[PDB]
Structures are given as structure tokens and as C-alpha cells.
Design a protein around this ligand. Structure first.
Ligand SMILES: Nc1ncnc2c1ncn2[C@@H]1O[C@H](CO)[C@@H](O)[C@H]1O
Ligand SMILES: [Zn+2]
Length: 359
């Protein structure tokens, strides 16, 4: 046996969530064999870990542990994606050296393991991690790969982890072209390529994304997250120009039957991040989160945590919210995780083993 007794498809009918306190429900969420496709490793940490970093480097001697969390993080949410991006820039204060980066990676993987994630695609932005202390992206990558390797080996590969590379917009020393070149340079370690930060229309980078994609690195980019944008151009470009296989967030797809039909026809999966959307005001409330409409419309959607460090949440919190506010069932969760497995960029030999073990 292992610590978590993962739920099997045959067992789901016997579980009566309606009986259960929140504590008891969380024991069930943990036992869902989760496949998570959208989590930013560089903003994936616990409160305790983050504060430990701030103390280690004596960055906030005049602030308390809780004042540190308020000053740096986004647990209470904010007005917009724009505000989130600015706050995340502050968090880079912790990217002091390669030891802390390795440790962040190790703890990020271990906590996902503890939470009952069996398949984990982590993504990170080399340029985002590098800018604050002018670090070497080669050594950042080395540290992250080492940290992940050491934990998955300790865990006897009971969690499978793959990495994606993010070229992003909205911090100093951001560079999409350089991020693409870096991704391809480290194609052996990266299973996919992303764009995050400010939501921009990525049509203007068509050439860079074509090159990455045609090199055999599939694309999943952030699009259809930011409700403040005056149209859905970013989604049309992601789908029609970038030819992405998945979309980060993509919740604004719900606002257009054309896009709904398009994503369905192209077998594109939307990597939905419920709590993120509510905290950034890209959904009015969890009660009105577009995932329900999208799921009912037949669109492939999966559940994701986005930035556990920024929101001081974990993946089981997103499951809790979907159950409580939108009446998602265990059967729904199982189906979505199997879609995530199918659409994962991980090696098919690995995915086949995970499918046979849990699904
Ligand atoms: N939900 C999100 N939407 C857009 N950008 C994000 C999101 N989460 C993290 N990022 C960005 O990803 C990078 C860190 O992985 C930073 O550019 C950060 O702003
Ligand atoms: Zn994201």
C-alpha cells in the first residue's frame, strides 16, 4: 500500500459526499487520482515555505509572518490579472540563488504528491525566475530539474512530473523569442511551451510559435482568461494561428458558440483554474463560473490550481469549490482527470501506465 488509497471508478457510487463535513470531503478529494496540467512551479509554494524564504534572506525584518503574506501574495484576491502580474513580480524577491530554487521545486512536487496528484505538468518562466537577481537561466533550469528528479526518485515515481517552458510578458527582462530558443535547446526536458503574464494576442509572434510547434513541442498558451479585454481575439489567434493543443484558462470560450464548436471540433482542452478566476475577478463568483456551462456544452475541461503560492491554496481546494458551488460529482472529476491524462504532453508510455494503474 501507499499513504493514499486512491479512488477507483467502481467505488465512486458508494461515496456519499452529502453526508460529509468539509474535513471528510477533503479526505475524498485527496483520494481522487488527479492529473493537473496548469500549475506555475515558480509560484507554487505553501505559506510556511514562502515565509521561510523571506526570513532566510532577511528580506522583511520589520514585518511579521502574516504581514509578509499580505505584502507579497494574493490570497484575498485583487481587481484583475494586471494586479496579479504586478504582485507576482514582488514574489521574485525569493529567487535569491539556485539552492532556494531547487528547494522550491522539491517542496512543490512533494506537496502535489501529498495532495494525491499522480500526473503533474509543472510550468515555469526562466526569465521570470532570472530577472530579480540576474540569475543564469541554464543554472535555474538545472536546479529545477535536479529538485524534481530527487523527489520523484525518493517517491519511487509514484508521482510523474513533466515540465513546460513559459515565455511571458509583463516583467523586466521578459523575452518570448529567447524563451522559445531556451525551450527548444532543452527539448529533452520540456514537453510543451506556453505564454503567460499579461494576456496578449499572440498572432504577432506567429513565427516563433510555428517554429516551436513544428519542432515537436506542442503548445498550450494562456488565452481567454482576462475579462477586461474588449474582444476574444486572443482565443481566435491561439486556436487558428498558434494551433494550440490546449488553452490555459480559456473560460471566455463560453461567451461564443463559434469558439465552443471550434474547441470541440479541434479536440482542444481548456485548463480551467476555478479559484484563480474568482480571485482575479475573471469570474463574478464560483456560482457563475463558466466551467459548468463549458462542461455541459461538451467542451473538454480539466481542473487546475494555477498558482498555489500566490493564492495560498492547493488543488483540492479547486475540487472543493466545484463540488460545493457548482454541483460537480466524483464521476465528473474522474472524467476530467482522464481527459487531462489523454491531453497531457507527457510520454505516451508513461501515460499508459498511469491510465492502467488508476483509470
Ligand atoms: N493565471 C495566470 N494568468 C496569466 N499569467 C500567469 C498566471 N499565473 C502565473 N502567471 C504568470 O506566469 C509567470 C510565472 O510562471 C509570471 O509571468 C506570472 O505572472
Ligand atoms: Zn496560469
Amino acid at each position: 500500500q501507499e499513504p493514499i488509497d486512491f479512488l477507483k471508478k467502481e467505488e465512486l457510487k458508494n461515496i456519499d459526499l452529502s453526508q460529509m463535513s468539509k474535513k471528510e470531503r477533503y479526505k475524498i478529494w485527496k483520494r481522487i487520482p488527479k492529473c493537473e496540467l496548469h500549475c506555475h512551479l515558480d509560484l507554487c509554494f505553501s505559506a510556511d515555505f514562502f515565509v521561510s524564504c523571506i526570513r532566510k534572506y532577511n528580506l522583511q525584518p520589520n514585518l511579521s509572518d502574516e504581514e509578509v503574506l499580505d505584502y507579497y501574495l494574493f490570497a484575498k484576491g485583487g481587481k484583475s490579472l494586471g494586479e496579479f502580474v504586478e504582485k507576482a513580480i514582488k514574489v521574485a524577491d525569493i529567487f535569491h540563488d539556485y539552492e532556494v530554487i531547487e528547494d522550491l521545486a522539491k517542496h512543490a512536487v512533494f506537496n502535489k504528491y501529498k495532495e494525491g496528484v499522480v500526473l503533474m505538468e509543472f510550468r515555469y518562466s526562466p526569465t521570470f525566475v532570472a530577472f530579480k537577481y540576474n540569475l543564469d537561466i541554464e543554472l535555474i533550469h538545472q536546479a529545477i530539474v535536479k529538485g524534481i528528479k530527487e523527489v520523484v526518485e525518493l517517491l519511487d515515481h509514484k508521482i510523474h512530473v513533466a515540465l513546460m517552458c513559459i515565455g511571458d510578458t509583463g516583467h523586466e527582462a521578459a523575452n518570448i523569442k529567447a524563451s522559445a530558443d531556451f525551450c527548444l535547446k532543452h527539448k529533452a526536458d520540456f514537453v510543451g511551451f506556453d505564454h503567460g503574464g499579461h494576456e496578449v494576442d499572440l498572432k504577432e509572434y506567429k513565427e516563433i510559435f510555428d517554429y516551436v510547434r513544428e519542432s515537436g513541442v506542442p503548445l498550450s498558451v494562456h488565452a481567454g482568461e482576462d475579462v477586461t479585454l474588449p474582444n476574444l481575439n486572443t482565443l481566435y489567434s491561439a486556436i487558428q494561428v498558434l494551433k494550440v493543443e490546449r488553452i490555459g484558462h480559456g473560460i471566455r470560450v463560453a461567451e461564443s458558440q463559434e469558439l465552443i464548436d471550434m474547441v470541440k471540433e479541434k479536440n482542444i482542452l481548456l485548463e480551467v483554474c476555478p479559484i484563480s478566476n474568482v480571485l482575479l475577478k475573471n469570474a463574478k463568483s464560483m456560482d457563475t463560473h463558466p466551467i459548468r456551462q463549458l462542461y455541459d456544452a461538451g467542451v473538454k475541461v480539466s481542473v487546475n490550481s494555477d498558482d498555489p503560492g500566490m493564492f495560498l491554496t492547493n488543488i483540492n481546494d479547486d475540487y472543493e469549490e466545484l463540488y460545493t458551488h457548482l454541483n460537480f460529482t466524483l464521476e465528473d472529476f474522474m472524467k476530467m482527470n482522464e481527459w487531462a491524462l489523454e491531453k497531457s504532453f507527457m510520454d505516451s508510455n508513461i501515460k499508459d501506465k498511469i491510465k492502467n494503474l488508476y483509470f
